[PDB]
Design a protein around this ligand. Structure first.
Ligand code: Q7E
Lengths: 412, 412
């Protein structure tokens, strides 16, 4: 019968910090992690900035020998996973290793490594492709490498659902625990899409902000002057654990995961429907799964991408789901500060939602100077808002019309 | 408690055929789908052959214009998915569309597209990258395009667990139905990694057979002269359906999906442990999940990739799990004929497992001329074996030590 699931550990690399506390300090201070990209020459590109992880030292985690074989998205996902496992205090033993699994996902995976090997193939020949090309690039190898390093023998998989990946990863990992397939899961996502193919491919779709001359103001969810998403890198990981398992070992519990929703839009390969119908279906599924009155929702960490169509679809979905209560809850987009971590967005934002519960504060939507037509909810413009938060919801929406919603609540 | 899950539709593209019945006729005849790869200069490569899909006409499924947007692996997954839904006879309606979802995955995804867009980026710069590069390449677009085309609003996601993808996709879709999150799921996987990067990437790891002189004899699982796997393309899709839902509409039921196992080896990035400990745990988990004794198993569709370490690990796992029943079951590798479809392997092999139950016949392991040391099980060498089959397993073992097992049972 369905077990309860709590959060006992969290880990992060983001454009605001090399761990959770440093990132959250930046979130609550309204700080932007966005800057001109330094790691490559983008003069031929329409977008030349994004949210880089600054000063990442892989030798805090892995030998230089192993790090050299692994795409940055794997290095970032292992960094966040190791932080989360250490934060949990959990000791892996022969008695429990078969009951601990991992579900760390990515939207795009090891595009930097694939591009660099493609360069070798075309400039030199196939004999110069790395022997580590496949295991160092493919998306399931955060789960694989974490399992090898920590001895995790539970369910071992990876989701790839574009910008919904981190939220789906955490929800499905929670279902694994709820249904008794595991007692502990490390779940979340990682992304490092800031290579020519990533910036070029999103640039070709004209999906990205082109505010090159003022990168910290580019990400402006629900602002009338928004012009697309800001591409960002990093990772979030959470240790999910069955409630009685956590209680038995005296774990510190940050919050309980009470609800998860999925829905498909079935509308368009890339565009969200203007009325947010799929997002509304998804939230309603999540609230019913959590056994809640929608009026219990205090805080929503929106997807809030800073796209014209995305941001207004989310307002429409929240109004449809919450009715008059839409005007009482607080909703913010932390992408205003972090940018869009794609398959890691739902993972870092789940962590921000749990910290909103721990600290009783709604993170701001920075850059919300002139709310657009109909964007008239409490969007926590400019500055963090201390408030009562018993229930927090984190939404994600992606290409393919794929939607996820997580519902967290205070645990006493 | 849990609902029962049955298979009511199947669809496939393989090196043997452009549908299930053509592919299956090849399987029972012991035919190879392996040949030198055409319309591609592989002079500089150590492997020049594989399993291609021959004569695929995407305009049976999509307009030319929609097809131009999508990588071949997405085209192949949509072909299998549309076939499976047609084969099921299911009528999607406003009354059931929120109860029908999709989980079609891929191991490596859009390599061909990445390679072609790399060419443009390196030669001409980012302004020649296609606008559809991202949504036409990412792994969740089979699920996305299928949901949009058929109006499916249920759970919409995509797994990527390397060579385990198709098995995990089917198993987790079965969990969705069993636990009441959906009544119908389209599940499986697709792959087209025959590009410079795929042949070059596996080649650099010296993982591929290099038997260029006799491609049809390259894939020789458990044979003492095997020298690595054969890379193959295609797709498999199954319609999974809650039993009472199938019975109410008069569905044709092929078989019941009674068990699903997952485990992680936690051993090595690409190699299984010599004793197949992880594969043994995974099969034991799948049998416990089905409430079956190892002695009830009649037929195993092996992962059976034709790698030195993989093939011998599976023999050890089967001996461990099955004890004095290990010789009574029949175990065959259909990869002897199809080669290794990577993330689609588990999907086409679940279909072959279901058809082994329908037709009471174990498919052959072709090329098994000289069984290796300790390879003394009933490996169905050379020729199909009519036999009693009530319970059939299908195993997948992938990079990162990720394991999956499905258990199918005759339905009457
Ligand atoms: C001082 C910190 O960077 C330690 C990171 N860490 C290594 C394993 C788990 N957390």
């Amino acid at each position: 019968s369905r077990r309860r699931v709590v959060i006992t550990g969290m880990g992060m690399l983001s454009p605001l910090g090399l761990d959770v506390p440093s990132s959250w300090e930046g979130i609550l201070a309204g700080r932007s992690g966005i800057a001109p990209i330094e790691h490559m020459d983008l003069s031929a590109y329409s977008t030349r900035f994004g949210g880089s992880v600054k000063g990442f030292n892989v030798e805090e985690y892995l030998s230089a020998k192993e790090a050299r074989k692994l795409d940055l998205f794997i290095q970032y996902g292992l960094a966040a996973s190791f932080q989360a496992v250490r934060d949990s205090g959990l000791e892996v033993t022969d008695a429990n290793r078969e009951r601990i699994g991992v579900s760390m996902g990515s939207g795009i995976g090891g595009l930097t490594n694939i591009e660099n090997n493609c360069r070798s193939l075309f400039e030199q020949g196939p004999r110069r492709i790395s022997p580590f090309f496949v295991p160092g690039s493919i998306i399931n190898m955060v789960s694989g490498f974490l399992s090898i390093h920590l001895g995790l023998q539970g369910p071992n998989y990876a989701l790839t659902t574009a910008q919904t990946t981190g939220t789906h990863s955490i929800g499905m990992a929670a279902r694994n625990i709820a249904y008794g397939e595991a007692d502990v899961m490390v779940a979340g996502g990682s992304e490092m899409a800031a290579c020519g193919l990533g910036l070029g491919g999103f640039g070709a779709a004209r999906a990205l902000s082109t505010r090159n001359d003022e990168p910290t103001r580019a990400s402006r969810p629900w602002d009338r002057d928004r012009d697309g998403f800001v591409l960002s890198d990093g990772s979030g990981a959470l240790v999910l654990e069955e409630l009685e398992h956590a209680r038995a070992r005296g774990a510190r519990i940050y919050a309980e995961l009470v609800g998860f929703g999925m829905s498909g839009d079935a509308f368009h390969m890339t565009a969200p429907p203007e009325d947010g119908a799929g997002a509304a279906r998804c939230m309603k599924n999540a609230l019913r799964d959590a056994g809640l009155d929608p009026r219990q929702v205090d805080y929503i960490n929106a997807h809030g991408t800073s796209t014209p169509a995305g941001d207004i679809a989310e307002i429409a979905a929240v109004k449809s789901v919450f009715g008059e209560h839409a005007h009482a809850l607080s909703m913010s987009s932390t992408k205003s500060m972090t940018g869009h971590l794609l398959g890691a967005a739902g993972a870092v934002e789940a962590i921000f939602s749990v910290l909103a519960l721990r600290d009783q504060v709604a993170p701001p939507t920075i850059n919300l100077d002139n709310p657009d037509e109909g964007c008239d909810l409490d969007l926590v413009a400019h500055e963090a808002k201390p408030r009562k938060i018993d229930v927090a919801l984190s939404n994600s929406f992606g290409f393919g019309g794929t939607n996820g919603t997580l519902v967290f609540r205070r645990f006493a």
